[PDB]
Amino acid sequence: DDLLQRTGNFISTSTSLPRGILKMKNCQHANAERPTVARISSVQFHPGAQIVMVAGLDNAVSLFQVDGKTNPKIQSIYLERFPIFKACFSANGEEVLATSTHSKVLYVYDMLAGKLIPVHQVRGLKEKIVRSFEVSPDGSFLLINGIAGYLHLLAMKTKELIGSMKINGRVAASTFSSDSKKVYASSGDGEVYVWDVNSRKCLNRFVDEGSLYGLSIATSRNGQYVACGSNCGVVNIYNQDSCLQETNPKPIKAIMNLVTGVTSLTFNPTTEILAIASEKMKEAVRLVHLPSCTVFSNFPVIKNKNISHVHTMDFSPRSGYFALGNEKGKALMYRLHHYSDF
Amino acid sequence: THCYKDLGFMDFICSLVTKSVKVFAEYPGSSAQLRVLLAFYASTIVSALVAAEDVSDNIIAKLFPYIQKGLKSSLPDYRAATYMIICQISVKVTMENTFVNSLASQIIKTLTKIPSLIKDGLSCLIVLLQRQKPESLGKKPFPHLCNVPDLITILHGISETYDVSPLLHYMLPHLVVSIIHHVTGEETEGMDGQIYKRHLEAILTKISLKNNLDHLLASLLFEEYISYSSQEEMDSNKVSLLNEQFLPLIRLLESKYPRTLDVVLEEHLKEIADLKKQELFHQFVSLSTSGGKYQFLADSDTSLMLSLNHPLAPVRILAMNHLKKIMKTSKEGVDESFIKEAVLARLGDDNIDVVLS
Amino acid sequence: VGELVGARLIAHAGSLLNLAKHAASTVQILGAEKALFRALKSRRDTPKYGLIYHASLVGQTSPKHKGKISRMLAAKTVLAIRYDAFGEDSSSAMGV
Amino acid sequence: NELVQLPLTENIPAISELLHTPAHVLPSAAFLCSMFVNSLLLSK
Amino acid sequence: VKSGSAVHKMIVDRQYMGVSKRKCIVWGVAFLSDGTIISVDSAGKVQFWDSATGTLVKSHLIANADVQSIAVADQEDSFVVGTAEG
Amino acid sequence: LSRYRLKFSADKVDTMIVQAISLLDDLDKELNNYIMRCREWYGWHFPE
Amino acid sequence: EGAKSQEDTEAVFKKALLAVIGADSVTLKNKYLDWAYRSGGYKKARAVFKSLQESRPFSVDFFRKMIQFEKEQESCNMANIREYYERALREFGSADSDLWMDYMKEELNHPLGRPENCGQIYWRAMKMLQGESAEAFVAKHAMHQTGHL
Amino acid sequence: ADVNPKAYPLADAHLTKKLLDLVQQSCNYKQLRKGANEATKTLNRGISEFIVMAADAEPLEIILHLPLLCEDKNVPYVFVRSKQALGRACGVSRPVIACSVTIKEGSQLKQQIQSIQQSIERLLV
């Protein structure tokens, strides 16, 4: 009835993530137990366990227990002459897949069975080297970027080729849809193609606004947003329905904060944060509040001068942790106080 | 900037506005004299709330008595300025459930004093019920909310252009409970329960329900009917009264939105089969025109729709046999169409005994 | 810009199409030819008003802001000059 | 699932223009309340 | 034709699912009613394209040398190709 | 035949804009000279 | 008009505009526009107004009459209402305080008007008005803010 | 489709990629003038290699004075479908409707500029 005949509060916390200011605290480095000086190519959080995997230009692949204080080492594996271009977990999380720069063989590490299977020969595949690849969220498909604008679809369980898709021009980047029923491929002339997984047909061809050539592409888990990065540092965010039906879609908001070409795009699992990065400049990483399409003003503390060049970003499955990998061999980790679960 | 950073200036402005309003209240037909000043009072404070990076509890604690004074006044412009201030505060800051409850209570209780500011006030409530936590508001202001003249007509007028979903989302769970309480018991008046059922009927007929309010209403009706039918006392006469009260509502909810009742019945089959509540489910589906196609079989815990086309062939015979009994008896929960396509589809399958049935 | 100022602008260039070929900066300093060449030879500061000084918008503004308004008016004015010279439909929709 | 961005005061141009005018030029508070509350509502 | 503008330009890979310095020469093109383009390339392959989207539909590698001739019957259920091998 | 064509491309000619702004200045000069004589000649009769 | 055909009335008006060229043409144009609405409809008035919109000797009654005709018609296109006011303010905006005040009340009272434009109209009114007319508009607006109007 | 016919030298998809790539190089070597007003001064000074214009300027007439000046100086001019693409190629965070590549002695873009000039004039047959 009245709040000034008693003593009490007026301001309370919201369930949704607040805009403008992000509450964060620095944590211990992910690769603290295993220090290195080589560039960190990939960092990723395990889907079902508190495990973080760090791979880099040094030939080692490591798995770490995710603890804020110490981050103890679980296991580290060194390959002979295999500088890891990209390493990722499977959708189920049971096996680890890694690839190298200018190497034909693809390494599959099955943790449950304790077997390391090198897939050097894929039948029906004419590709000389395998460096760029993506995995579907459902876990039934694997996509390999090739040459002459070729996309190769492989079964996950047996690693055998299903079919091929050819686009005009070079393949710059590719990603899978949230439902895993479609493929988004960005070409080298700024055009983006949409392919159907079940029948390898081109559903639609739309054009990213003001893009000479694209470098990255990402999709949200809920299926609402599609993000495309270009050479000028401009990231365009679209509705997924707009991309499917319009040849010249109008983006919801074009992020002009980054000034150098965007190479990394990562969506928050709750679809409230978009992380953008450029490796050509130091301190070139930003965070975007998705519903408002506004950038948090407090994340990059440029005086500390720790982030430097950014090559890989990842979020914990419940968005409790944020990971960052640089060229100095430091896998930086931050905790977001808004999310209390790993 | 000096208004939001320095609280003394804001207190000065509010005190000046209140004193000027109190001075000019005595003279009849002096509302125009307070125009510009009140506009100034509307112009700055909202803008101040826009300018502040974070609105601390001090600002809201200072603003609240003046908000209450604006709500209690009879001047239209002063109430309008209070409404704008309340709207901006609700948009910007998150509030505890108690303070939202008190603010909504004060908005609802003083709505009818000025008849020219009803609509905006209701719309203001919608904003307060859209930017806050869903269960912030309680049940205490519900009667005074129902007693305002021509509530559903104003709600429909607002609905033609803007979304009115939060107010109905708040209203319906209370409306069903209050209707059941009127059916079995006493209220403030019999016309109170009558105006409750009239409100729910008018909401069903005139205002289109969107954002899955249909599923919520159907689930509330089914769940609470089953819950009251599960009371320790028999109340057979009260049960019949409740049935004749809910019959037209179920009729119209089926008619306007066809498939919602089927889905909500499908979602609730499992726990009804788990418990010994098959007879109550049969009574509820008999209350509807369609939904008797989900009648449980006499011997097993399966629905009639699933019994007709599930893989196991022998027990399917009983289903058609049950349909035959449903054929001969007084069909009340089932319709002609379902029986027709069921028999037409079952004439042509593999099993010869099924063909004979 | 007005009836009188527009008429003087056309007369200076000799025709409407000749005025259309000019840039936005030239239209601003079209009237002030004596100050322009005196400043250019002596390496002094260039004039900023020209014939636009007698425009209605420039006249109303305070003397401190008469410099900013002159270039904003001149940049927008040439857009009306090009469309009136080359467009085949006579209307005031864009100018308003 | 679906994320919807509710309207905000600073984004609306009409509300900003109404708030940038001098107070004596400004119209009565009832009209301002009508426009403000209508703009704050979600349009369907 | 009722325009004279090139709606689609289709890039042909110089080697079958690969790249080479030698330029690929399209020796013959056949056009069907459904909208599919049949092309024969110097890399030794016959390619089926879709005109509506301007993307490759299928490829067939049939020879180690040039495939140089294309011909389709009046009823579009059969066609013939010739290779440099004879 | 010629005058049928370029007539339809007329009313977009500015020869009367450059001939009516120059005349507008000339009339101002003659007005200034003529008023001065009127005030001067009649100022010897009613100077106030 | 009383005892002759419609076409002859228009012929007399056109002869009158040719004979009278100076300030006396002001009353001629006003009666010509009034006749067009009576003899014809709104469409006839629109044709006459378009022909006479460029004959510079005018009065404020010419534009006020045309605004009233648009108001009586069921359409009430607000773009045309603004379009007539801009032409009137171009001719007599420097000295007519009432015309500026009448324009501002249209944006408030009319259902299709935009009240948020009143900030720009007041700003434009001060600069174009000269001398005592500027002071008159302030006093009239100050009375309009109160109920005295 | 849906292009104003007054932009006759319309480059196709392949030529547009070559055009914007060259414009990007010219920005890096400080050989590009940005804006319709700055472009116009280059033709009057006769130091322009070629002119690139944006076809989707909603009033297209505001840039139609440039083709007339080009035809006197014998300077090739071409239209592109997007001003947003033209603005990003020029390295500006705002749309650009006209840009000019200027004459520079000793430029390493001379072979590329010559090739594009042969391409643009080839459109006019």
Side-chain angles (χ1 to χ4, degrees), chain A, chain B residues 1-185 190-231 236-329 332-357, chain C, chain D, chain E, chain F, chain G, chain H:
Chain A
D1 62 358
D2 191 86
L3 277 297
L4 264 55
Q5 182 42 265
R6 60 156 85 80
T7 187
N9 215 332
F10 276 88
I11 284 292
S12 70
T13 62
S14 66
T15 58
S16 297
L17 181 78
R19 60 188 268 159
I21 301 299
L22 202 57
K23 301 290 180 67
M24 321 156 68
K25 180 178 68 65
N26 61 338
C27 291
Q28 183 65 204
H29 301 286
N31 58 331
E33 294 293 328
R34 207 210 175 251
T36 187
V37 290
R39 191 266 306 280
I40 296 299
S41 53
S42 282
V43 59
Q44 187 172 1
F45 277 108
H46 188 267
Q50 310 216 0
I51 286 157
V52 65
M53 170 205 76
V54 184
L57 289 201
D58 53 352
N59 299 320
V61 186
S62 297
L63 296 103
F64 293 147
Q65 183 66 252
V66 176
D67 183 68
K69 279 76 178 175
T70 53
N71 291 294
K73 187 171 70 62
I74 297 167
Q75 186 178 2
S76 175
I77 308 105
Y78 175 85
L79 312 181
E80 186 175 1
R81 60 180 67 88
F82 211 76
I84 297 89
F85 179 92
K86 197 214 172 192
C88 70
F89 278 126
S90 56
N92 51 47
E94 305 199 4
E95 64 184 0
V96 181
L97 301 93
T99 183
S100 181
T101 64
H102 196 276
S103 177
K104 183 180 287 293
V105 55
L106 172 84
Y107 265 88
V108 174
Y109 178 69
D110 195 344
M111 301 175 288
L112 271 299
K115 297 187 289 185
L116 178 73
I117 311 99
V119 177
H120 50 98
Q121 182 171 214
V122 176
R123 303 324 198 115
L125 180 62
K126 298 293 189 291
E127 202 56 42
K128 297 196 168 332
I129 65 153
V130 178
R131 66 173 67 187
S132 167
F133 81 101
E134 294 293 328
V135 297
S136 296
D138 60 355
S140 63
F141 283 109
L142 188 153
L143 183 63
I144 288 177
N145 297 149
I147 55 172
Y150 264 104
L151 293 144
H152 298 93
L153 202 51
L154 289 72
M156 201 55 168
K157 64 179 72 65
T158 58
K159 304 311 197 278
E160 59 91 17
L161 185 64
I162 300 293
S164 297
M165 291 155 298
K166 178 176 170 64
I167 74 165
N168 316 79
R170 195 171 40 92
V171 173
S174 81
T175 186
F176 273 105
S177 283
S178 55
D179 58 354
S180 298
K181 302 286 101 175
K182 292 182 289 294
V183 175
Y184 283 100
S186 54
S187 83
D189 60 354
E191 188 146 45
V192 186
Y193 296 178
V194 193
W195 293 90
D196 188 287
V197 172
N198 272 7
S199 51
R200 279 82 66 193
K201 300 291 178 67
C202 171
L203 291 194
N204 188 245
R205 285 171 60 175
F206 66 95
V207 179
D208 198 50
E209 289 183 352
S211 67
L212 279 74
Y213 57 98
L215 282 77
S216 65
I217 190 166
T219 48
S220 59
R221 304 231 301 181
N222 58 344
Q224 184 180 260
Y225 292 130
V226 170
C228 309
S230 67
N231 53 345
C232 295
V234 166
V235 171
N236 298 335
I237 306 177
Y238 303 82
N239 279 115
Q240 184 174 0
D241 279 15
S242 175
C243 311
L244 297 190
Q245 310 178 20
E246 307 191 24
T247 183
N248 293 113
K250 183 70 175 177
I252 295 171
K253 171 79 178 318
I255 311 290
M256 321 275 308
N257 290 106
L258 271 194
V259 65
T260 310
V262 176
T263 61
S264 297
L265 293 181
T266 304
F267 269 96
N268 192 243
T270 63
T271 301
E272 309 181 328
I273 298 171
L274 175 55
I276 63 171
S278 164
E279 81 190 47
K280 298 181 178 67
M281 281 206 318
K282 292 181 174 67
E283 322 297 346
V285 58
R286 293 290 185 287
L287 291 174
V288 176
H289 189 258
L290 294 174
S292 181
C293 286
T294 58
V295 171
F296 291 101
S297 66
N298 57 290
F299 162 57
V301 188
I302 71 163
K303 182 67 181 294
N304 305 2
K305 304 154 104 192
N306 305 329
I307 288 169
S308 296
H309 294 283
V310 176
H311 290 89
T312 306
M313 294 182 286
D314 190 74
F315 277 113
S316 67
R318 323 274 301 271
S319 190
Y321 282 97
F322 172 56
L324 191 68
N326 62 4
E327 68 177 0
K328 300 292 179 68
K330 312 166 68 61
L332 318 164
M333 203 180 328
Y334 310 92
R335 183 180 179 273
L336 304 179
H337 301 274
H338 176 69
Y339 308 92
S340 63
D341 291 319
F342 170 84
Chain B
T1 308
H2 205 262
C3 184
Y4 82 86
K5 284 192 177 296
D6 186 36
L7 293 170
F9 190 58
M10 181 195 318
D11 195 290
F12 171 82
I13 298 194
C14 300
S15 85
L16 159 69
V17 167
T18 51
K19 186 174 61 186
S20 178
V21 160
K22 183 169 291 293
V23 172
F24 272 111
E26 62 182 358
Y27 298 135
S30 59
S31 294
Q33 319 292 305
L34 281 152
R35 188 202 301 263
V36 174
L37 173 64
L38 279 165
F40 165 81
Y41 176 52
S43 191
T44 53
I45 303 287
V46 164
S47 305
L49 295 163
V50 171
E53 51 275 60
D54 62 316
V55 180
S56 57
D57 72 18
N58 298 263
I59 302 187
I60 305 154
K62 185 169 291 293
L63 279 188
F64 177 76
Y66 299 111
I67 291 167
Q68 191 168 357
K69 291 181 180 180
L71 288 180
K72 295 295 182 181
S73 177
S74 62
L75 281 179
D77 293 333
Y78 192 43
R79 200 179 265 215
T82 308
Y83 283 154
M84 310 172 34
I85 286 160
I86 286 161
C87 282
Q88 173 70 36
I89 294 190
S90 51
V91 169
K92 187 153 289 289
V93 299
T94 317
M95 311 145 58
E96 293 83 3
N97 291 318
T98 51
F99 179 67
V100 188
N101 198 2
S102 186
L103 202 58
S105 291
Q106 283 184 10
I107 296 162
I108 297 165
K109 285 182 179 64
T110 68
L111 201 45
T112 65
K113 296 183 183 15
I114 301 170
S116 72
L117 278 186
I118 306 291
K119 184 174 179 295
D120 302 79
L122 282 175
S123 173
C124 181
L125 195 71
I126 290 160
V127 177
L128 185 68
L129 268 73
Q130 190 170 2
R131 310 245 179 175
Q132 293 305 306
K133 277 157 285 178
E135 183 65 26
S136 51
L137 191 48
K139 66 181 185 64
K140 296 187 67 173
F142 186 65
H144 324 89
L145 185 46
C146 297
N147 288 323
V148 294
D150 293 78
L151 173 60
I152 309 301
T153 315
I154 301 311
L155 281 167
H156 178 57
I158 299 170
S159 300
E160 281 157 19
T161 306
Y162 306 106
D163 190 8
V164 74
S165 282
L167 199 47
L168 299 176
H169 187 80
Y170 166 73
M171 264 181 171
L172 294 169
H174 294 109
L175 271 169
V176 173
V177 171
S178 288
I179 284 175
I180 284 178
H181 285 329
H182 168 68
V183 165
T184 62
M191 61 79 71
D192 203 10
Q194 189 68 212
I195 208 59
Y196 292 162
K197 70 176 71 65
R198 267 198 293 264
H199 281 88
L200 188 153
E201 273 172 334
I203 287 162
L204 268 170
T205 66
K206 292 190 287 184
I207 313 169
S208 61
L209 298 152
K210 296 180 181 297
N211 304 304
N212 282 254
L213 288 176
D214 292 326
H215 183 260
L216 177 62
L217 183 60
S219 74
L220 283 170
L221 283 175
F222 172 79
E223 278 161 358
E224 193 175 357
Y225 178 86
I226 291 303
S227 177
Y228 173 77
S229 301
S230 179
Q231 287 303 314
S236 294
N237 53 323
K238 284 312 151 283
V239 160
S240 74
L241 284 173
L242 191 54
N243 285 6
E244 60 87 19
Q245 286 301 318
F246 291 169
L247 187 144
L249 295 181
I250 300 286
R251 296 287 189 266
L252 188 153
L253 183 63
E254 184 86 26
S255 63
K256 285 189 177 294
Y257 312 93
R259 203 185 297 86
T260 59
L261 282 72
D262 289 334
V263 177
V264 70
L265 282 173
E266 288 189 317
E267 296 160 85
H268 289 93
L269 287 173
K270 291 285 303 311
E271 66 272 15
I272 289 298
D274 276 357
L275 291 175
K276 303 297 183 291
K277 274 194 210 311
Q278 290 83 16
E279 64 279 14
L280 291 182
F281 187 91
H282 292 152
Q283 189 176 181
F284 182 89
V285 298
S286 299
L287 291 188
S288 63
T289 42
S290 87
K293 64 181 68 171
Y294 291 104
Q295 277 166 40
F296 269 93
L297 284 184
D299 297 330
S300 75
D301 290 334
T302 183
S303 62
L304 190 46
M305 281 205 48
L306 189 146
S307 298
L308 290 175
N309 308 320
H310 74 93
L312 282 72
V315 65
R316 258 145 60 194
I317 292 300
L318 300 187
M320 283 74 74
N321 276 320
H322 182 229
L323 193 67
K324 278 175 225 149
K325 294 182 288 292
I326 292 304
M327 185 64 72
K328 291 183 178 62
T329 57
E332 38 183 3
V334 71
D335 59 306
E336 161 147 3
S337 300
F338 165 69
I339 294 167
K340 284 222 312 188
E341 316 108 341
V343 296
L344 272 193
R346 288 297 94 190
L347 284 173
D349 65 350
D350 189 71
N351 183 12
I352 304 301
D353 298 14
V354 168
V355 176
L356 179 47
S357 67
Chain C
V1 295
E3 297 88 357
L4 267 176
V5 182
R8 299 208 181 273
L9 276 175
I10 294 171
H12 196 110
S15 180
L16 183 54
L17 301 175
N18 294 352
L19 180 70
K21 293 188 287 184
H22 274 114
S25 66
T26 73
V27 174
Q28 179 183 43
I29 320 298
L30 193 62
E33 283 142 341
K34 186 255 285 182
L36 189 148
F37 295 123
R38 178 176 97 229
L40 273 189
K41 295 169 186 178
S42 284
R43 299 173 191 180
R44 301 295 285 294
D45 292 328
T46 58
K48 45 168 153 53
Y49 295 127
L51 265 175
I52 308 296
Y53 197 86
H54 305 109
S56 298
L57 298 177
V58 186
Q60 300 162 344
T61 59
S62 63
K64 36 182 307 184
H65 306 107
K66 291 179 85 95
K68 319 200 195 309
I69 293 316
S70 186
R71 44 181 182 98
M72 302 180 181
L73 188 57
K76 253 53 190 176
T77 311
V78 305
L79 298 182
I81 294 169
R82 269 72 172 269
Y83 169 59
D84 284 4
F86 304 122
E88 71 280 329
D89 51 354
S90 298
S91 55
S92 312
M94 183 179 72
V96 166
Chain D
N1 204 2
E2 288 85 19
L3 288 201
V4 186
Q5 176 58 74
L6 296 173
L8 284 173
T9 313
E10 68 271 16
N11 294 117
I12 309 164
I15 296 313
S16 67
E17 292 295 327
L18 212 52
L19 284 187
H20 292 337
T21 186
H24 53 287
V25 187
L26 186 64
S28 75
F31 287 1
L32 313 176
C33 187
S34 307
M35 271 156 267
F36 194 66
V37 177
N38 288 354
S39 299
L40 286 195
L41 289 176
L42 188 137
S43 297
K44 62 97 176 179
Chain E
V1 59
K2 182 210 81 75
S3 176
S5 61
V7 286
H8 294 284
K9 182 181 285 187
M10 283 155 154
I11 302 299
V12 169
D13 50 353
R14 293 178 180 176
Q15 196 270 330
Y16 176 80
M17 301 215 318
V19 298
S20 178
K21 299 289 94 176
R22 291 177 64 89
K23 295 180 186 293
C24 200
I25 291 150
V26 184
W27 283 120
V29 174
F31 203 90
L32 305 182
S33 309
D34 59 19
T36 56
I37 291 154
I38 300 169
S39 67
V40 294
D41 303 298
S42 67
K45 61 186 183 293
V46 167
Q47 301 194 287
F48 296 161
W49 308 79
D50 165 59
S51 300
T53 71
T55 50
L56 178 81
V57 176
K58 192 183 287 184
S59 294
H60 283 147
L61 175 64
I62 59 153
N64 294 114
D66 296 333
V67 179
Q68 293 177 355
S69 65
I70 185 66
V72 186
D74 283 358
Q75 290 183 357
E76 293 179 353
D77 59 351
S78 176
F79 76 84
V80 65
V81 306
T83 73
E85 311 264 27
Chain F
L1 185 61
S2 314
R3 294 211 211 300
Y4 194 100
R5 288 162 54 65
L6 73 164
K7 192 261 209 195
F8 284 140
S9 71
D11 186 74
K12 297 296 289 183
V13 299
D14 43 0
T15 81
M16 301 295 327
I17 297 304
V18 65
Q19 288 284 309
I21 191 66
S22 307
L23 196 49
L24 194 65
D25 300 345
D26 296 350
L27 283 171
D28 271 348
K29 287 176 67 68
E30 309 322 322
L31 206 53
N32 261 321
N33 299 350
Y34 292 164
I35 181 63
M36 212 73 47
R37 276 145 182 68
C38 294
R39 311 187 81 107
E40 194 171 348
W41 298 355
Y42 200 76
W44 303 332
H45 195 92
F46 194 52
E48 294 84 7
Chain G
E1 180 65 27
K4 190 60 66 68
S5 58
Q6 171 173 229
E7 303 74 17
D8 300 306
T9 64
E10 186 145 26
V12 169
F13 269 119
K14 291 181 181 179
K15 296 297 294 296
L17 269 296
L18 285 157
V20 176
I21 75 159
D24 295 332
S25 297
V26 163
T27 62
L28 267 183
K29 284 148 180 193
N30 282 303
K31 295 183 184 294
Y32 191 20
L33 190 64
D34 286 314
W35 163 84
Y37 201 64
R38 292 186 293 111
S39 68
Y42 176 69
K43 277 76 177 175
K44 181 69 175 176
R46 279 282 280 191
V48 173
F49 185 89
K50 184 177 180 180
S51 83
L52 302 187
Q53 73 190 352
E54 292 302 319
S55 305
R56 293 293 178 183
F58 279 134
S59 65
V60 311
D61 272 358
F62 204 65
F63 298 95
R64 289 184 184 272
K65 277 168 197 301
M66 187 66 204
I67 284 156
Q68 179 62 256
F69 296 160
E70 182 68 28
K71 268 157 145 173
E72 289 162 353
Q73 298 302 110
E74 69 275 16
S75 307
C76 294
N77 191 0
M78 187 66 204
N80 294 116
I81 291 285
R82 297 203 251 272
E83 192 270 333
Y84 299 142
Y85 268 117
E86 294 300 294
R87 299 182 142 273
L89 287 182
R90 184 175 297 277
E91 294 318 308
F92 320 98
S94 66
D96 198 359
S97 297
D98 287 331
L99 186 52
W100 282 98
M101 191 75 238
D102 276 315
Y103 187 28
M104 183 177 176
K105 294 188 290 294
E106 292 293 327
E107 292 275 43
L108 293 172
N109 294 321
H110 201 253
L112 291 174
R114 298 231 62 90
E116 60 271 24
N117 306 343
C118 293
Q120 206 188 15
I121 311 297
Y122 185 97
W123 180 86
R124 288 170 62 210
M126 296 271 89
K127 287 187 179 295
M128 274 198 41
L129 284 170
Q130 317 268 112
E132 44 276 46
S133 66
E135 270 171 343
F137 180 76
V138 165
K140 291 179 182 178
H141 180 261
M143 292 278 248
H144 164 75
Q145 290 305 289
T146 56
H148 306 292
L149 298 174
Chain H
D2 213 318
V3 178
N4 197 314
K6 291 182 181 180
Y8 185 76
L10 202 45
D12 53 8
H14 189 303
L15 191 46
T16 302
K17 184 54 202 283
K18 312 182 70 134
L19 288 172
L20 295 185
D21 193 349
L22 185 55
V23 169
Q24 182 62 257
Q25 293 323 339
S26 64
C27 172
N28 292 341
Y29 288 89
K30 301 288 186 180
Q31 296 178 1
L32 181 84
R33 285 311 217 286
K34 298 179 288 293
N37 283 311
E38 287 188 77
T40 306
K41 289 233 179 155
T42 73
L43 295 83
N44 301 335
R45 286 208 261 287
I47 62 170
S48 178
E49 307 278 14
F50 58 93
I51 296 288
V52 182
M53 274 158 299
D56 63 68
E58 197 277 309
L60 189 50
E61 301 86 350
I62 68 183
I63 55 184
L64 294 193
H65 72 288
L66 295 163
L68 306 163
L69 288 169
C70 289
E71 288 156 10
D72 179 343
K73 304 296 189 292
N74 194 347
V75 167
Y77 61 92
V78 68
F79 286 85
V80 291
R81 203 153 289 95
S82 167
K83 58 188 173 186
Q84 297 278 342
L86 191 51
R88 305 296 179 60
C90 291
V92 174
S93 298
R94 292 295 289 177
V96 179
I97 56 183
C99 63
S100 175
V101 163
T102 47
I103 277 160
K104 181 67 179 294
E105 294 293 328
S107 179
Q108 313 86 352
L109 279 71
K110 181 69 176 177
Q111 204 255 338
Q112 312 186 229
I113 288 176
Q114 183 62 255
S115 177
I116 301 299
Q117 281 165 343
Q118 273 145 29
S119 310
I120 294 173
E121 311 216 20
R122 184 176 179 179
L123 299 172
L124 280 85
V125 175

